Amino acid sequence: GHLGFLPRKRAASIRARVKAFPKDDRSKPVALTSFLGYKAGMTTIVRDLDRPGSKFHKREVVEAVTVVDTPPVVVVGVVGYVETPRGLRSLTTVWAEHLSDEVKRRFYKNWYKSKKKAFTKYSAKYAQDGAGIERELARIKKYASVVRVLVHTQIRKTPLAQKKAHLAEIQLNGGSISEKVDWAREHFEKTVAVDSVFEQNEMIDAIAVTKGHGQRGYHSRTSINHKIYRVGKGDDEANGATSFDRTKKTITPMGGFVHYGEIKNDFIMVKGCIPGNRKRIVTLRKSLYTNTSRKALEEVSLKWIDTASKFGKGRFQTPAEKHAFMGTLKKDL
Amino acid sequence: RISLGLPVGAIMNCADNSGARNLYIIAVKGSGSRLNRLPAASLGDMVMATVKKGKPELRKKVMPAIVVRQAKSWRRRDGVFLYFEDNAGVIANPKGEMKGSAITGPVGKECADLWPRVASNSGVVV
Amino acid sequence: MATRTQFENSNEIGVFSKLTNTYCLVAVGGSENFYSAFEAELGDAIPIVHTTIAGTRIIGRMTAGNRRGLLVPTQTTDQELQHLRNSLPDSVKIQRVEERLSALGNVICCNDYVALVHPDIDRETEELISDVLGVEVFRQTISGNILVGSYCSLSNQGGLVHPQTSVQDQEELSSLLQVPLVAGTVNRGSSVVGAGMVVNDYLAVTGLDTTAPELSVIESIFRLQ
Amino acid sequence: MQLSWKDIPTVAPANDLLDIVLNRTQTRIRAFYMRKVKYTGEGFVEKFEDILKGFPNINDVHPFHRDLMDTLYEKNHYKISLAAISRAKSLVEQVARDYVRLFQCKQLKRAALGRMATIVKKLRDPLAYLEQVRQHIGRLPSIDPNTRTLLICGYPNVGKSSFLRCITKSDVDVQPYAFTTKSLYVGHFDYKYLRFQAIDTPGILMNNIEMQSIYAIAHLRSCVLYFMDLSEQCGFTIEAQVKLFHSIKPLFANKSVMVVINERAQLLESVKEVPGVEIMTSSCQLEENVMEVRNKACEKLLASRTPFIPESVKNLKKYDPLARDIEAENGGAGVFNVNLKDKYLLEDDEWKNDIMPEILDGKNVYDFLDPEIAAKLQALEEEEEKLENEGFYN
RNA sequence: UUCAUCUAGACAGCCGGACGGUGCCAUGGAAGUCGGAACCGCAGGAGUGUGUAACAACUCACCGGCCGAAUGAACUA
RNA sequence: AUACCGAAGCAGAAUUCGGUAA
RNA sequence: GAAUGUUACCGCAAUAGUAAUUGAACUUAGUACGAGAGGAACAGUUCAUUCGGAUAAUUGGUUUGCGGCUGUCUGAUCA
RNA sequence: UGUACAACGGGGUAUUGUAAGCAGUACUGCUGAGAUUACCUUUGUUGUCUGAUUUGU
């Protein structure tokens, strides 16, 4: 057994705690250092191997790729940090004036029984000329060194019975922390898309809690060197609008995703599998730095995508395939 | 990834006109760190076999043998998962100079590409 | 005229490529040494098609044809066939063949005049070859080997048979095929002369290990010089 | 075995051999001493066996090699050193078998080393001789007796030094003195598509070198090309050279002899007295005469539906130094991928990106895909519209 | 602590002289310097090493222009 | 447990030795 | 899972467990070397084996649910 | 007290290949049928939406 991955004690929460960020680039424009989303099932994808010298070089090759259910990231605040001899410390936290019901639920377990006195008087302080809630920005500018944005996911968009919001801190790539806080404030209550941070062929890393076998499993894990193959937009239609297979369909498997994960929002395709099963929230990061190897730098296309259901063994790809061979079906037509 | 299917000593069929009828895989090369679990042959693998039925030169003397078929369903990166007639092999020197002047039956694409001379001596592919 | 090459430190020159008087076919990979010779001897007078057959690197042994056209086996993929049709000019035909055996180069020896095929060739395929290639088809048993193309090589100007070919067979076939025949070797005595070299009526390529006497014999028999 | 030699292991006489084992190796006390003896003795035996096996024996190889070793090193000493090494190994085995057969136990192990050192250290002189001969035998040329060979003999530095250099690839000093070429020289050249080897020797003027050359000439089948000069190179008169050539007369005639020469032309008649020799003028600083001599030596040793050629095919001229240049400009071949688009002969300049759907959600597109199916499109479609007058669902 | 050098120039360090008869066996080259056996004419070995087939050329030990007083070798602790 | 240094008449391949280190 | 303010959310980390591992192919190669066979090499690329984490794209030992097969029988086929 | 919770049959999904009968020509058209469907789905109807304890510088 691995010595580093011991003891095997289970994680304390579904969300995996991120404790490392890709340094701090003082020259890059302001951008998010990571992304948050939810994990769906898995599928299959094939692409052309442009890698030189490979056995399957310049040939179509099948690769296993998972699908991450990514809801839009709506900013709710930002957190500043200051260097100290006792380690990094969060000097001040601020919020985006207004908070959705899902965000308020995160602070409540018996939400229905509670009088729902969530963020309210704080908004009353904001409901004026600003003063303290505006001087906090100046205080952050004066002393802060690294600023982490505070965002939550649109859980109600995800097909999850649990409507409680999930929130985590994300560091800002850009320098000039004044610009960091200015951009964060301007983005208060705004919605951020995947294209604003990640991009196709980027070697992102995945971190999440492992599957529980029902103590084996249910522990946080980090997987690095995973290449994105296509930015997905499940809000629209015809997600399979690739250059090949001009018979546009949807990435959703027949009858919906197995067990759970009926995609109804943005999604992303990532090379290989991801730790943990569906219904688990997964955070994405740029993998610190980008390797210069062809396996990490080369860009890839996409073609065949499997759509047959897995509620059994799998056969039918689309409902329109059932005709001709079955003759008459008086029960239906 | 190389599986652990066919073990040492499998009396696989012979598909060459050298006069051999069966190939007993007495020895398998490439057995390095795969301890505890016995090695296994595979398509295009470097293995040696002794012809059970044949002349004395091929009895008690171990010579390399190249496997051209496996019968057992195998995974492929191309996305195909079919299988064909049966497992087969040929007797050749370590450099691939097959003694048999002709080869019968299909030859796996996995081994044909990595053994140019073996493929050249075979007509049926896949 | 004959060239020297060592594809990826290998010796089977003809396995990874096929050549005719009007077009050239070569395998694909990472090494450029093998592709260098074709440009050196011809530059771009004929299309040097970098292509694979059925996803295999044994393109030379998997394809048979002559100046009048080319044909590919069943296992060739739809993408392969489409890109081959988009690689060859309209003046050159392309054909697909359905049969149990697939290695056309190992099954059929093709020249500009007469095509030699495996004796078990089906009637349909036997008659099909003549139309596209415009050549006669006669079953052949060179050297008493059922797989004539697995080791033999026959250019339009002659025929370099593998060393296992008997003298009587060469004498019988020289006056029947109307072409000269000589038994020799390549790659410093390799018996598979059909894999270690490619030869036509003006161009030839041989492995690095090929000795001077073999090169001279190949040049003289085929009337290159 | 190999005509040349270099794989022979090296020998480090005296302290080095002892250390190689001492440093490696360095009632349970008795067992530990037994284990130590079972390792030191085995190491010594392995070293002795490696020394014996690696070093070839004078009389165990080809008689020509035996003679060559005899004339280079000391004949008797070569066998004496081997006998001494064998005796040392036997004594080591005897010592090991003797042992095989606190205050008191402390002295048990000492005797083994005390006697192994006595056995071994005394072999320094034979070991020194072995090491000395190892260096000389590890660089012997390829004096192959089987392949056709030619030799040259005569007075040293009469222009002979440059003859082999100008006949085949070789570097020979032309400095004039007793023997500029102290040892044998070998050169390889190809004729008639078969290998020919040229070898040279200083000459004969006794000394160990003279006997070595004489025995090499006699044992081998190589022809001897005696060297002379029409001019007076080296300063020796024609009579002295003729007498020296006659000195080699008793054993040179059976090798298909020739003579190469750089009132003057009349005195050479004495050289022609031997019917077997052939004499011709030549020079060591030019190519035509040496090549003629080489060709003559090789000749002497030899006895010991119509074709289709397009005009464009012959129009292009062979390139004079390529894919190497293209991929080199592209930053490498193995590190660079192959390219298809825009290279292969596209059917047309319009559809540069045919993407073949190759999927029908149940079957491959190519199962029925075909071009110019417009006529079928205006006929088959009527089957899905004529249902009004029938209805196949019934 | 013993011996030695003593502005008749201590020791380190630069430049020069380092010659003559001249040598025999190995003869193939060996002349100081691969190996046989050990003089002296006037600060200098028939030679401590480098190196050439060997002379060739540098050299240390010995002296000279040279520097301006402690210094070189072994011991006692 | 593997390799890193210096040496061998170590041309290359290849080999041995003194130190580091398990 | 017990206690310092009640409760809960997001964070820092004193501290401790450490992880990778071996072979193979191209190009530098028939290059430097070298009479000759034989054959360097850095760097740039492509794979698997030893071991570790993952998930089921596929495979694999692994809802009597759909087709029918036997017996006691409802009388009689439908059960 | 809003498609908030949950029942359903439907719909997709997975599975099977000629079921109950009737057309007699000693198995033939309905009939690749009916069918279940603890995975997704909850579209219309329909039911529920109110309890005990404790905490508090």
Assign residue C143 a region (left: φ > 0; alpha: ψ between -120 and 50; beta: otherwise): left
DSSP A29-66: PS-BSEEEEEEEEEEEEEEE---TT-TTTTSEEEEEEE
Residue ranges of the domains in chain B?
5-126
Q: What class is the A6-71+193-210+217-331 domain? A: mainly beta
Q: DSSP secondary-structure letter at B50? A: E
Q: What is the DSSP letter of A11?
A: P
d(CA B29, CA B39): 9
Measured distance CA(A245)–CA(D359) in Å, rounded: 6
Q: Is the backbone of residue C215 left (phi > 0), alpha (psi -120 to 50) or beta? A: alpha
Tokens of A205: 């890393």
Chain C positions touching chain A (beta carbons under 8 Å): 28-30, 52, 55, 79
Query: Amino acid identity of C164?
Result: Q
Q: What is the amino acid identity at position C124?
A: E
A 10 A CB-CB count for D335 gives 12
- CA dist., res. D33 & res. D110, Å (int): 10
**DSSP annotation of D268:** G
Range list of H helices, A81-176: 101-105, 121-126, 132-143
* Residue C104 backbone phi and psi in degrees, to 5: -65, -45
Angle at C131 between CA C126 and CA C132, to 5 degrees: 105
Rounded to whole angstroms, the maximal C-alpha distance in chain D is: 127
Question: D141 and D68 in contact (C-beta within 8 Å)?
Answer: no
Contact C166, C184 (CB under 8 A): no
Alpha-carbon gap, residue A217 to A9, rounded angstroms: 9
Token reading at A144: 């802060």
Q: How far is B13 from chain C (nearest CA, A)?
A: 19
Q: CB D342: neighbour CB atoms within 10 A?
A: 7
Q: Please report the DSSP string for D151-203 in residue order.
A: EEESSTTSSHHHHHHHHSS-------STTS--S-EEEEEEETTEEEEEEE---
How deeply is A228 buried, as exposed, middle or buried, from its count of CB atoms within 10 A (0-12, 13-18, 19+)?
buried
Ordered alpha helix ranges (H), chain B: 109-114, 116-120
- Strands C69-72 and C93-96, bridge-based pairing: parallel
Question: CATH code for A72-192?
Answer: 3.30.1430.10
- Write out the binding residues of D: 154-161, 200-204, 262
Planar angle of CA A59, A298, C25, nearest 5 degrees? 35
Q: Which two tokens stand for residue B72?
A: 């057992």
d(C-alpha C15, C-alpha D128), whole Å: 57
C207 by DSSP, 3-state: which?
strand
| Cα end-to-end span (Å), chain C | 8
Q: Classify residue B80 by its DSSP letter.
A: -
Q: Is C127 exposed, middle or buried (CB count within 10 Å of its CB: 0-12, 13-18, 19+)? A: exposed
Please state, in angstroms and rounded to a whole number, the distance separating the CA atoms of residues B75 and B70. 12
CB B126 within 7 Å, strand G: no
Q: Is B98 exposed, middle or buried (0-12, 13-18, 19+ CB in 10 A)?
A: buried
Token duo for residue D59? 């009389």
Tokens of D246: 């006659």
The domain spans of chain A are: 6-71+193-210+217-331, 72-192
Q: Indicate the helix (H) or strand (E) that contains B67.
A: strand B63-69
Each as own residue / partner, the long-range contacts of residues D138-143 (CB below 8 Å, 24 or more positions apart, any chain) are: D138/D5, D138/D6, D138/D8, D139/D6, D140/D4, D140/D5, D140/D68, D141/D4, D141/D184, D141/D185, D141/D186, D141/D199, D142/D3, D142/D4, D142/D186, D142/D197, D143/D3, D143/D64, D143/D68, D143/D184, D143/D186, D143/D199, D143/D216, D143/D220
D208 closest CA partner among D81, D68, D79, D76: D68
What is the total count of domains within chain C?
Answer: 1
Q: With contact defined as beta carbons under 8 Å apart, do B26 and B47 qualify? A: no
Q: Please state, in angstroms and as integers, the Cα–Cα distance from residue D287 to each residue in A45, D293, D319, following that order.
A: 71, 10, 30
Q: Answer for the pair D293, D281: CB distance below 8 angstroms, yes or no.
A: no
Residue holding tokens 């070998």?
D186
- The SS3 assignment for A200 reads coil
Q: How was this structure determined?
A: cryo-EM
Among residues A22, A99, A45, which one has the least CA distance to residue A230? A45
Query: Are C115 and C137 in contact, with CB atoms under 8 Å apart?
Result: yes
User: Is A59 at the interface with chain B, CB within 8 A?
Assistant: yes
Gap between the Cα atoms of C45 and D40, Å rounded? 74
Let me know: does A69 contact A270? Beta carbons within 8 Å: no
Q: Residue B4, SS3?
A: coil
Structural contact between residues C86 and D347, judged by C-beta atoms closer than 8 angstroms = yes
Residue D122 Cα to chain centre, angstroms: 37
The helix-helix angle for D15-25 and D110-121 (nearest 10°) equals 150
Round to whole Å and give the CA distance between C82 and C92: 14
Which stretch of DSSP H or E encloses residue A203? strand A203-209
Which residues lie closer than 8 Å to A11 by C-beta, 6 or more apart?
A209, A218, A219, A220
Q: How far is CA C68 from CA A225, C64, C93, C130, C199, in A?
A: 51, 11, 7, 10, 17
A60:B78 CB<8 A:
yes
- Chain breaks in chain C following residues, C–N > 2.5 Å: none
Angle at CA of residue A54, ends A52 and A56, nearest 5°? 115
d(CA D99, CA A26): 78
Q: Is the dihedral of CA D386, D388, D393, D394 positive or negative?
A: negative
d(CA C30, nearest CA chain D) in Å: 4
| CA atom of A322 to C1′ atom of H38, Å | 26
Give nearest nucleotide to D138 (CA–C1').
Answer: F9
Q: How far apart are CA A12 and CA A34, in angstroms?
A: 21
Q: What is the resolution of this structure in A?
A: 3.9
Give the side-chain half-sphere CA count within 13 A for D80.
Answer: 11
Question: What CA–CA distance (Å, rounded) separates C99 from C121?
Answer: 9
Touch between chain B and chain C (3+ CB pairs, < 8 Å)?
A: yes
- 3-state SS class at C130: helix
Chains with ≥3 Cβ pairs under 8 A against C? A, B, D
Question: For the purposes of burial, counting CB atoms within 10 Å of the CB of C112, is it exposed (0-12), middle (13-18) or buried (19 or more)?
Answer: buried
CA A240 vs. chain centroid, Å, equals 20
Both tokens of A9, joined, read 């004690």
Of A100, A189, A178, the closest CA to residue A150 belongs to: A189
Give the tokens for residue B10: 């499998």
**Residue to substitute from A58, A294, A301, A303, interface C, most C β-carbons within 10 A:** A58
Taking CA D282 as the corner, what is the angle to CA D280 and CA D285, rounded to the nearest 5 degrees? 165
What residue numbers bound the domain in which C124 lies?
Answer: 1-225
The CATH superfamily assigned to B5-126 is Ribosomal protein L14/L23 (2.40.150.20)
Query: After which residues does chain A have a break in its backbone, defined as C to next N over 2.5 Å?
Result: 214
Task: List the one residue out of C132, C56, C134, C46 whose CA is nearest residue C95.
Answer: C132
Residue B13 CB partners (closer than 8 Å, separation 6+):
B21, B22, B23, B86, B87, B88, B89
Q: How far is the CA of A160 from the C1' of H40 (A)?
A: 12
Alpha helices in chain D (DSSP H): 15-25, 28-54, 63-72, 75-100, 110-121, 124-137, 160-167, 208-219, 238-247, 249-252, 288-302, 311-315, 323-329, 374-380
Rounded-to-integer distance, Cα B107 and Cα B87, Å: 10
Residue B77 to residue A46, Cβ atoms within 8 A: no
| Chain centroid, CA A54 distance in Å | 32
Pairing relationship of beta strands B88-91 and C204-207 according to DSSP bridges: unpaired
Cα–Cα–Cα angle for D45, D48, D51, rounded to 5 degrees:
150
Q: Is the CB of A168 under 7 A from strand G?
A: yes
Chains that touch A (3 or more CB pairs under 8 A): B, C, D
How far, CA to CA in Å, does D379 sit from each of D376, D382, D386? Answer: 5, 6, 11
Q: Which of D120, D62, D52, D43 lies closest to D83 in space, CA to CA?
A: D52
G22 C1' closest Cα residue: B33
Q: Give C203: exposed, middle or buried? Use CB within 10 Å, 0-12, 13-18, 19+.
A: buried
* Strand E surroundings (CB within 7 A): D 175-179, 182, 205-207, 209
**Minimum-distance nucleotide, CA of A261 to C1':** H40
| CA atoms of A121 and A127, how far apart (whole Å) | 9
DSSP state of A18: P
Burial class (CB in 10 A: 0-12, 13-18, 19+), D93: middle
User: How would you list the strands of the sheet with C24-26, edge to edge?
Assistant: C17-19, C24-26, C48-50
Rounded, the Å distance between the CA of A327 and C1' of H27 is 19
Residues near C63 by beta carbon (within 8 Å), at least 6 away in sequence: C18, C25, C53, C70, C71, C72, C104, C105
Residue with tokens 């090296």: D10
β-partners of residue A79 are A93, A148
Distance CA C109, CA A199 (A): 52
Q: What is the dihedral of CA C37, C40, C43, C49, to 10 degrees?
A: 0
Find chain B residues with C-beta within 8 A of C106's C-beta.
119-123
Which phi and psi (to 5°) does residue A206 adopt?
Answer: -120, 135
Residue of C nearest to B103 (CA): C147
d(CA C57, CA C27): 6
Q: Which amino acid is at D26?
A: Q
With a CB-CB cutoff of 8 Å, which residues 269-308 of chain A face chain B? Answer: 304
Tokens at residue D34, please? 């037994």
Interchain contact D335–A (C-beta under 8 A): yes
Is the bond preceding A7 in cis, omega lying within 30 degrees of 0?
yes
Residue D138 CB in 7 A reach of strand G: no
Q: Which helix (H) or strand (E) holds C79?
A: helix C78-85
Task: Please check whether residue C72 is in contact with residue C84, taking contact to mean a CB–CB distance below 8 angstroms.
Answer: yes
* Strand H nucleotides where any atom sits below 7 Å of a protein CB: 5-6, 11-15, 29-35, 39-41, 50-52
Task: Give the whole-angstrom CA distance, residue D67 versus residue D208.
Answer: 11
Distance CA D359, CA B41 (A): 36
Closest CA to A255 of A326, A314, A303: A314
Q: How far is CA C159 from the centre of its chain?
A: 11
Q: Which residue of chain B has the CA closest to A59? A: B78
Chains B, A in contact: 3+ Cβ pairs under 8 A?
A: yes
Q: Which of residues 81-140 of A touch strand H (CB under 7 A)?
A: 110, 112-113
Residue A122 to residue A127: CA distance in whole angstroms: 9
Rg (CA), chain D: 39
Does the C-beta of D205 come within 7 A of strand F?
A: no
Task: Look up the CATH number of the domain holding residue C44.
Answer: 3.75.10.10
